[PDB]
Amino acid sequence: DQGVPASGQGKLISVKTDVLDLTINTRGGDVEQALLPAYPKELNSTQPFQLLETSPQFIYQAQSGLTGRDGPDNPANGPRPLYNVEKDAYVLAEGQNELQVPMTYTDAAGNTFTKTFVLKRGDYAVNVNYNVQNAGEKPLEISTFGQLKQSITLPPHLDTGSSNFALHTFRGAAYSTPDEKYEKYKFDTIADNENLNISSKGGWVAMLQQYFATAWIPHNDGTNNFYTANLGNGIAAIGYKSQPVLVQPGQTGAMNSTLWVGPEIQDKMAAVAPHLDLTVDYGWLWFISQPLFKLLKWIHSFVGNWGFSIIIITFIVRGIMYPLTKAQYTSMAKMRMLQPKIQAMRERLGDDKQRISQEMMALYKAEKVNPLGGCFPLLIQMPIFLALYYMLMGSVELRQAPFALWIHDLSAQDPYYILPILMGVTMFFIQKMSPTTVTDPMQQKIMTFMPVIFTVFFLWFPSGLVLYYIVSNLVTIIQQQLIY
């Protein structure tokens, strides 16, 4: 049950469905390229997104085969199997929901091995099935393997735009085990030859990027061997080897596995394999971004527009936090009332900062007013900002999602940078109509600059996030115009 073959030269065939465009090497049955038509390469582009790729500058393939004592893919048994395919192109026909691509190989002793890819319409989980006919008079020991192979360094077009994200979206390997429901493996750890070597009863191995994932999900009754491997020259690998299966003389056997190669849609992935939906990287705030997205998607089932759904989610969470905003408003009201007492205490005590502080903090403690003051609503807005940010940057459904007028991508920044200036205009409205609890000119000096510093803040942030806080502060303004 040991030994994974290297890539071999062979005839290439195409396999097309409505959502997948695969190139498959007949030697071994590896997927060398995979295109997703339902996801354009970039906004306003007719090219499909390229997930798997075999290129001189970059490699990313999903390999599989039969290893073990008698597995033809085992290098100890010779060269990789050169399967025979009847035609070079396989297309999903109209009215047909399922497409099968069989590949056969007969060894010198008469044993036949059939690798058949089974695809279905609108489905990103491709089934890789094996059928082995034993011709000899002693059993065959066969083990299923599946390997994901990719260059460690992404090709130059990797990064642009002056590190718009302070921390990039994750790109690397990951796996799941009945003991560890989801763990991540860095390519750099693999590059240092510190490899994974664990057992798992079921589970899956995977490779991840911002919006798309590849994964091998074994289907057997034994204990698999999940592994990573530094193949060298900057090529990382993760995969699995199944428990060996015996095939007695004159008997036929069947081995199954599933390959996911598509977008990180949690609803669709959770049905293919348990915990597979966790491949989406919601950052450290996973426990709030996943609920936020689930309800945002729930709103999308009614409105049908992701931007308006973000406008609605702002109203929802402005309502859940209204007692907190009203308590802070009550707190800030009493800070305005105590300004004459704190100026009179300052002129009574003199230049004694310590007892001025204790007396100010004690008077603040008697009638509950927040010592943090004006930056407390900025403090509690810090998790929701990061939560919504990781939700927009991690949800494939929001990728290239339009809103209205000049916004055709809620996940991307405003190309005209008009939304970040609009939010600064609303903040300039807020600070002017509100008493803004000004007491010292030094800290007040930066408060007049807050509209523009916070404008250039949102200049490199997703339009869907800027949109949220735009209508969030329109709710703030509408409240104080209706009270006054």
Side-chain angles (χ1 to χ4, degrees), residues 288-359:
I288 48 188
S289 307
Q290 172 248 281
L292 271 185
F293 169 73
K294 282 203 66 56
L295 156 66
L296 178 79
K297 176 184 55 59
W298 184 71
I299 302 168
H300 180 262
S301 54
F302 302 135
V303 179
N305 190 96
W306 288 107
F308 290 116
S309 297
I310 298 181
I311 303 176
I312 294 193
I313 199 96
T314 320
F315 298 151
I316 295 176
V317 304
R318 280 307 222 118
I320 196 193
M321 298 193 104
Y322 185 55
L324 166 73
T325 66
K326 199 195 188 73
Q328 219 271 339
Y329 187 87
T330 281
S331 177
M332 296 293 267
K334 308 205 166 206
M335 193 176 294
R336 271 169 280 155
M337 292 219 55
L338 301 167
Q339 297 261 263
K341 282 195 194 66
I342 70 170
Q343 67 153 345
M345 146 194 68
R346 153 169 329 101
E347 148 175 29
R348 166 251 286 259
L349 291 180
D351 182 82
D352 222 16
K353 313 327 158 323
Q354 188 194 255
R355 67 163 57 180
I356 272 180
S357 177
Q358 322 187 70
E359 272 201 30

